[PDB]
Amino acid sequence: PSSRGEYVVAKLDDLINWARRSSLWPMTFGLACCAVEMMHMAAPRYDMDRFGVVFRASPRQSDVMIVAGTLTNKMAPALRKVYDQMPEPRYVVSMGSCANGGGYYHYSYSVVRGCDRIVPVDIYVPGCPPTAEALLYGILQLQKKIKREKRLRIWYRR
Amino acid sequence: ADTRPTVRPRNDVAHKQLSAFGEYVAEILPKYVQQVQVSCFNELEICIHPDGVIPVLTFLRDHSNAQFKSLADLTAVDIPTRQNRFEIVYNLLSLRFNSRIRVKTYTDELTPIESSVPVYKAANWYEREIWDMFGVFFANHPDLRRILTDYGFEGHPFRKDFPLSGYVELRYDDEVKRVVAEPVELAQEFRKFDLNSPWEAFPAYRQPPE
Amino acid sequence: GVRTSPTGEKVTHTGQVYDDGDYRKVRFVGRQKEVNENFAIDLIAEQPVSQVGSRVISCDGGGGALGHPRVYINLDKETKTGTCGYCGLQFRQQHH
Amino acid sequence: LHHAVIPHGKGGRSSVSGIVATVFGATGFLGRYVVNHLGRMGSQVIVPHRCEPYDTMHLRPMGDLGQIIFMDWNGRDKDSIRRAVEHSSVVINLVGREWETQNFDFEDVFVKIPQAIAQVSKEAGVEKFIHISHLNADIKSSSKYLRSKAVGEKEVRETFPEATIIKPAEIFGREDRFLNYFANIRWFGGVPLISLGKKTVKQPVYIVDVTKGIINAIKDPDARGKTFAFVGPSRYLLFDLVQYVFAVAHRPFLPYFEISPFEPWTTRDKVERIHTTDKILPHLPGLEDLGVEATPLELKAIEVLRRHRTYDVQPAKTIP
Amino acid sequence: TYKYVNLREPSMDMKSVTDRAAQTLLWTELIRGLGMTLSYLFREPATINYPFEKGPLSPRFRGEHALRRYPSGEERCIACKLCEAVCPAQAITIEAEPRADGSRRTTRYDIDMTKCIYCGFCQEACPVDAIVEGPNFEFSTETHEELLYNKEKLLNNGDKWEAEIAANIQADYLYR
Amino acid sequence: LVSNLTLNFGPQHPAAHGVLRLVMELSGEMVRKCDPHIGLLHRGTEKLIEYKTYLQALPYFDRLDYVSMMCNEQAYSLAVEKLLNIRPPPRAQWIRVLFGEITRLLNHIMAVTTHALDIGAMTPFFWMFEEREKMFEFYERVSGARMHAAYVRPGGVHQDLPLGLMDDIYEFSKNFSLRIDELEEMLTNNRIWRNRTVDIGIVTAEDALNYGFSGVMLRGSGIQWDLRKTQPYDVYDQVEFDVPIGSRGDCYDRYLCRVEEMRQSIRIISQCLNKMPPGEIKVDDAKVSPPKRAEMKTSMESLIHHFKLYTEGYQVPPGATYTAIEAPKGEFGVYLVSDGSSRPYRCKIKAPGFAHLAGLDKMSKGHMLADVVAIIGTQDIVFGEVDR
Amino acid sequence: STSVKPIFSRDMNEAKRRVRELYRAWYREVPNTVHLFQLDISVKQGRDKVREMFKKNAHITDPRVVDLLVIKGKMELEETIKVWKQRTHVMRFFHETEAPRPKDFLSKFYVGHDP
Numbered sequence A: 001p002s003s004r005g006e007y008v009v010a011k012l013d014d015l016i017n018w019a020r021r022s023s024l025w026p027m028t029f030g031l032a033c034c035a036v037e038m039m040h041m042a043a044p045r046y047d048m049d050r051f052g053v054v055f056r057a058s059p060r061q062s063d064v065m066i067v068a069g070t071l072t073n074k075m076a077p078a079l080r081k082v083y084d085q086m087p088e089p090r091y092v093v094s095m096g097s098c099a100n101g102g103g104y105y106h107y108s109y110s111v112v113r114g115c116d117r118i119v120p121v122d123i124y125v126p127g128c129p130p131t132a133e134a135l136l137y138g139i140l141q142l143q144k145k146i147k148r149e150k151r152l153r154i155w156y157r158r
Numbered sequence B: 001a002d003t004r005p006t007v008r009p010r011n012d013v014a015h016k017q018l019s020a021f022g023e024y025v026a027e028i029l030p031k032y033v034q035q036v037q038v039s040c041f042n043e044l045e046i047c048i049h050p051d052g053v054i055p056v057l058t059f060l061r062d063h064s065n066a067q068f069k070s071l072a073d074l075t076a077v078d079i080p081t082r083q084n085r086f087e088i089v090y091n092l093l094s095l096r097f098n099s100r101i102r103v104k105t106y107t108d109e110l111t112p113i114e115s116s117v118p119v120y121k122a123a124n125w126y127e128r129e130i131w132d133m134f135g136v137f138f139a140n141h142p143d144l145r146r147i148l149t150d151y152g153f154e155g156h157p158f159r160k161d162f163p164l165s166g167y168v169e170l171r172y173d174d175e176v177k178r179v180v181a182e183p184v185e186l187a188q189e190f191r192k193f194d195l196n197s198p199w200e201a202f203p204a205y206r207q208p209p210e
Numbered sequence C: 001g002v003r004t005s006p007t008g009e010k011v012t013h014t015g016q017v018y019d020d021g022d023y024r025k026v027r028f029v030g031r032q033k034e035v036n037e038n039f040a041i042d043l044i045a046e047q048p049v050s051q052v053g054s055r056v057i058s059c060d061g062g063g064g065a066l067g068h069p070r071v072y073i074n075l076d077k078e079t080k081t082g083t084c085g086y087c088g089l090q091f092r093q094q095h096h
Numbered sequence D: 001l002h003h004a005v006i007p008h009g010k011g012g013r014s015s016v017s018g019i020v021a022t023v024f025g026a027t028g029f030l031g032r033y034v035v036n037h038l039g040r041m042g043s044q045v046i047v048p049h050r051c052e053p054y055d056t057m058h059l060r061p062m063g064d065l066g067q068i069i070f071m072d073w074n075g076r077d078k079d080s081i082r083r084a085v086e087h088s089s090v091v092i093n094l095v096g097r098e099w100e101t102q103n104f105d106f107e108d109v110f111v112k113i114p115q116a117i118a119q120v121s122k123e124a125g126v127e128k129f130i131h132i133s134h135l136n137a138d139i140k141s142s143s144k145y146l147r148s149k150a151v152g153e154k155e156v157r158e159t160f161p162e163a164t165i166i167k168p169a170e171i172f173g174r175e176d177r178f179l180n181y182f183a184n185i186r187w188f189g190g191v192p193l194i195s196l197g198k199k200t201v202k203q204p205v206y207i208v209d210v211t212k213g214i215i216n217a218i219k220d221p222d223a224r225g226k227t228f229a230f231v232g233p234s235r236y237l238l239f240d241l242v243q244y245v246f247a248v249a250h251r252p253f254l255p256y257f258e259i260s261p262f263e264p265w266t267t268r269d270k271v272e273r274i275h276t277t278d279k280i281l282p283h284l285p286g287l288e289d290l291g292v293e294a295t296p297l298e299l300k301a302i303e304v305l306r307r308h309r310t311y312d313v314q315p316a317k318t319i320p
Numbered sequence E: 001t002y003k004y005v006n007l008r009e010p011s012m013d014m015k016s017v018t019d020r021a022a023q024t025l026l027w028t029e030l031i032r033g034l035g036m037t038l039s040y041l042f043r044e045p046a047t048i049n050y051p052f053e054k055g056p057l058s059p060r061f062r063g064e065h066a067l068r069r070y071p072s073g074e075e076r077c078i079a080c081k082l083c084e085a086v087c088p089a090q091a092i093t094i095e096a097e098p099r100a101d102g103s104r105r106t107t108r109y110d111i112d113m114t115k116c117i118y119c120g121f122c123q124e125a126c127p128v129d130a131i132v133e134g135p136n137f138e139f140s141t142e143t144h145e146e147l148l149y150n151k152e153k154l155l156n157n158g159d160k161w162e163a164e165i166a167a168n169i170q171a172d173y174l175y176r
Numbered sequence F: 001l002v003s004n005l006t007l008n009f010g011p012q013h014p015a016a017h018g019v020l021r022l023v024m025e026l027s028g029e030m031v032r033k034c035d036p037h038i039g040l041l042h043r044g045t046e047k048l049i050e051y052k053t054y055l056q057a058l059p060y061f062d063r064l065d066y067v068s069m070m071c072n073e074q075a076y077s078l079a080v081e082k083l084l085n086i087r088p089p090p091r092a093q094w095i096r097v098l099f100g101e102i103t104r105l106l107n108h109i110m111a112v113t114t115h116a117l118d119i120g121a122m123t124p125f126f127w128m129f130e131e132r133e134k135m136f137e138f139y140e141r142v143s144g145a146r147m148h149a150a151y152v153r154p155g156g157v158h159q160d161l162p163l164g165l166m167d168d169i170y171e172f173s174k175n176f177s178l179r180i181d182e183l184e185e186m187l188t189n190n191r192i193w194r195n196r197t198v199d200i201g202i203v204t205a206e207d208a209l210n211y212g213f214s215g216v217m218l219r220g221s222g223i224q225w226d227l228r229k230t231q232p233y234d235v236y237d238q239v240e241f242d243v244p245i246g247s248r249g250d251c252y253d254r255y256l257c258r259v260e261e262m263r264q265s266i267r268i269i270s271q272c273l274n275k276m277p278p279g280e281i282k283v284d285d286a287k288v289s290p291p292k293r294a295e296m297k298t299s300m301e302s303l304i305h306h307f308k309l310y311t312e313g314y315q316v317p318p319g320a321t322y323t324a325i326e327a328p329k330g331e332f333g334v335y336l337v338s339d340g341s342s343r344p345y346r347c348k349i350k351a352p353g354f355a356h357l358a359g360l361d362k363m364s365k366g367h368m369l370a371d372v373v374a375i376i377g378t379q380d381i382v383f384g385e386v387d388r
Numbered sequence G: 001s002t003s004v005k006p007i008f009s010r011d012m013n014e015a016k017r018r019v020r021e022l023y024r025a026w027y028r029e030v031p032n033t034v035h036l037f038q039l040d041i042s043v044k045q046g047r048d049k050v051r052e053m054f055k056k057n058a059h060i061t062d063p064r065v066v067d068l069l070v071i072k073g074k075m076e077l078e079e080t081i082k083v084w085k086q087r088t089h090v091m092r093f094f095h096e097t098e099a100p101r102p103k104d105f106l107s108k109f110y111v112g113h114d115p
């Protein structure tokens, strides 16, 4: 057969992307209420595992961090610690108003006004709390975001 | 109990019983009790001099006609106009007699308050909360230290003069590879509303003119 | 009523546009500036005037409890129509 | 000025500084620090990036909401440059590779690209242009890296005469490829490839001082049209420097890797540069003229090398 | 009135003692626990096939915000600022002025969707049903800036979702 | 002090209660000292409430014990109503008991199943959240929100029950006792579960009262105390149910008490469905409760009261009250002080989990490290209310 | 009146004693802290900061205000010794990200209206 380098890189990129989105093992900070809706996303009706998303993942095997609740100033150092220990590729999902931008404690002295002040965020899931279905939509949006990555294709043209 | 659908009925037998017990406590501990009042919705409060905490709390716990075995709560209120700005409130519960009672005292920034842990072990964390949020020091407390605020947090947030958003905010700095505190700057300032109406609502609470 | 500024940016129904030298229009480069295209001012002009036969007419915007609060409008003046404060509908008194 | 670009606030995160900067090469070692400092004071940073969006995620926390904007660009496509500098006041250029690749050689990263970024910046109305060069840049140097730096520095000074050209020495820091080079390449799998290390004198500068120097060149109105030289407090002997690095990393030092695809780690030209001697050009202004005090190596070398250290230290000897 | 959850006295006849001995040695209750799990394996799973199937909602559901219009096309909002005053999270920012035709209309209407708690107090307080919480709950974004809605966005949401919003109001306005 | 193990649940697991930093001294397998550090979900809620009207402050109470949303609302509403000197109408009192018991079921499923999940028994967690998911639909149909309903308000409830809700609640309640029975077929007589809970974290009756415990933590030790029976507050004097009482004060009795409370909640829910009376849902007094949207668009007085209620808010007479309810976790109480304006002067929240967690060190003495997981679970700690 | 209940000290001599003791505990600690927390400062910089914190409160003469200052300083020490803090809390004393803020009239005049 005959094939260019550009074609080979495009197909290998699709393979690794398909594997990375098909097997997303999430770490979940269950900081507050939004953790309860994260638990409903694992329960029978939605069953995130059927997408390949394991119920429980350790911090140092995790692929995505889900920040489900209010990030207080006392807790912020610990969350950045966990984020650094995560091996790459690593993605953060910000779930709910509190994590997205402080929410209903935005004007508090003890609350970080959004977790994007601490860690980079890939997807923002609105709600207080987002419904289990709304979080599931967010995770499926992360899978499509990963599908569009072009790591190998960029590397070839460097 | 009246045919007024929207008005809370009055229980007058409870009001009478709580007033009788207010005198009883005042008669027995006259050295310490400064005031006794029962509200319209039937809640007895005993105001005491800050030095009568342990004698007053002990008497209510152990007396055969008090038996307020349970400390339901312990908190402080900040009223900056008062000279003793902090008011310490004890809510107690009696299961033998199915009754509640409130004990109140006061202090300032620089007056310690005797710890009630000797009387109610429940007060250990309540007083740590009072110290942390209000900066009221309790003497003879087994382990007094912050319980809610972040380590190294300067100030006492629940004081009326502490600003709502505080003075410092945290972010992550790439250059120093850690979470750094910095002076607070809000993208949108909290908008203060003046909601009080200029017309009096409750004549029964009118205060005499200066 | 979506007209564009000389730069090329569409003006909003509030009349806002980034002037020629404002750097804040970079936020739209590679993206788009969202502008609702149905201008409420131009749509409420199109509505016909409602000729009536009494001095006072009440408007609630339609739908009963799905409209705005009910307002009574005076139509004595002949030089102008009477307009609803809420919904902007116009009324006139018939041949009178 | 313009009512939008008038500084407001107290210089913090949510404040306004009036700096609207396009930083090319923002995703490198030097870029991450510049974007960080520009974003502490509330600047509007446009980040043209060639890489994946994933590789830029570290820059996002560095600004308030809306302050960091990202764009695609290609050094060969000029119209992608123009879209990046059209609304900017200062255009900082940090583009470079320590190594050649198939697509970009040293004469394309350092001459053709910087000249294109400088020309479009002129034609787009940009006012300030920061261009980075090398202290040891020389037309007659063997290291091709530095000879390209010499020509490219010559074309910027013609395309954009009011441009501030900054010439640093080897820069050291947490993510540098200078001290991290002496700790790793020399140690693991190898014994130092030092080529007559007693003959080389080095004057390295801390990253933050370079970052501070670049910022003040934006805020300082006399910097326009001037070439600068950023050098550390001390001159070191390349032999001693490597020795000192090893002591910090607790790796034993005993006096005495092919380039490949991926990312050449150790290369033919890199050695030629680590051995070039830090030129002294007294007439050029340095960090002293921008309000920055050069920081000692000793203070900010335990910071860099604490990671290499496995699981009472004496400094190096300076050359007057 | 109370009951004793665990105040039994175990019988000390040989027949009962042998029953507990058989249970201890033959793992009877443990087998029974295995039976219950076996029964669930043959029960039908409660999972639904998202996104092709969706969980049931009601007309009262509180989702994304939108600004509505009258049938004629004029905006319902009269800039009374009752929603801004009630908003528990201070998520709403309003400015107003007289429009070119003298009408009382906003020039700025913003909701910081990252401040909002999706409580629906603003739609309860609006006198003209101008601000509503729609039925959309699938609008997660990739950047924070995409969740700060200005007037155009909320007007566009009203134009986008009016068909459904109006029907939901029709279904619940009598309860309100 | 053989070794100090600073155990941070920072890298949280599927519990969702929050995050707890636990500092312990392990003299071998045994625990000699336990020291919970609890600032991680402190959000300044009590201070923020001072800048909000009474209506604006209500949603804060949904987000305290965020598995007891409508029970926290009722406590706030009962406190405010007491200061206002008004009374909610009889239909709303039944709706507030009805959803108070649907909330108790919601809380105990989380309490028992996540307690068992931490001790390795994962399956009942999935069995029962299919039921909580059906209960979340009742919340959404009456309020529009699955969790933070904001539905119980001073004066009554926001809206009336939609037509067809009570039938669906009855259908859920009819099949629910079997769901509990399946749960006991996996835990009640299971020797492994009993070995992990029997004679663990024993609390004496005398130490329970002095440490401030309430709820199951008292009744496990044999104290006959339930606020719904001794200090009833809505219509709880008109419904028959029994209080489960423990005999040994250990985790296993506390586990049994909660499972029996779920059965008594279904008993109560049955009576509420049959006795639901007709009428209005909020106090018919428009200086407190907003008027109907039809009246506000027709009547001048209604529009004025609507306008003021959603801006200034209703003013509450000066005074201070301590109101407590039998929340699922324990006694939930608010000490609310009114200065006479429309914004509370001070709102102190009494969380049952605050005292229970402070009593952890007492209970953990002389137990292995793996028992501490069982002790915290049996306390039913959620850090929304521990910190506030 | 001037008759006030005491915290610990009954006059400044006792208070200055506890102040002196608390400085001993901090002076000994900095060498340990700079290691356990792996700080990038020298032990000299750390001990200067402890000197700076103690100096700023020099004017105080009320015995009660000094007791509380000591009580708070010990709580700070207890957190650092027991390693309840983290590397971030310990380094907050040094304000290493806040840019230089001027203090001369002309400098404040150029930048903003703040007095």
Ligand SMILES: NC(=O)C1=CN([C@@H]2O[C@H](COP(=O)(O)OP(=O)(O)OC[C@H]3O[C@@H](n4cnc5c(N)ncnc54)[C@H](OP(=O)(O)O)[C@@H]3O)[C@@H](O)[C@H]2O)C=CC1
Residues within 6 Å of the ligand: D024, D025, D026, D027, D028, D029, D030, D031, D049, D050, D051, D075, D093, D094, D095, D096, D097, D098, D104, D109, D132, D133, D134, D135, D168, D169, D170, D171, D178
């Ligand atoms: N650090 C030092 O020791 C010294 C550095 N300098 C100068 O400092 C500048 C940056 O330093 P450093 O940050 O260490 O360099 P880096 O290599 O660390 O980063 C360089 C940047 O240039 C970008 N880049 C490289 N090649 C191309 C290309 N062909 N097209 C587009 N973008 C490209 C890279 O983006 P991507 O990663 O996306 O490819 C990267 O962000 C360079 O110009 C260098 O010459 C001068 C003297 C000393």
Ligand code: SF4
Residues within 6 Å of the ligand: A032, A033, A034, A035, A068, A069, A070, A095, A096, A097, A098, A099, A103, A104, A127, A128, A129, A130, F063, F066
């Ligand atoms: S966003 Fe809402 S539900 Fe989530 S933690 Fe915050 S208050 Fe609770």
Ligand code: SF4
Residues within 6 Å of the ligand: E086, E087, E088, E089, E090, E091, E092, E111, E115, E116, E117, E118, E119, E120, E121, E122, E123, E133
């Ligand atoms: S739903 Fe509630 S928090 Fe959100 S904008 Fe409306 S009133 Fe404000």
Ligand code: SF4
Residues within 6 Å of the ligand: E076, E077, E078, E079, E080, E081, E082, E083, E084, E094, E125, E126, E127, E128, E129, E130, E131
């Ligand atoms: S949306 Fe409604 S409540 Fe808000 S300003 Fe407009 S008309 Fe008033």
Ligand SMILES: [Zn+2]
Residues within 6 Å of the ligand: C059, C060, C061, C068, C084, C085, C086, C087, C088, C089
């Ligand atoms: Zn009208």
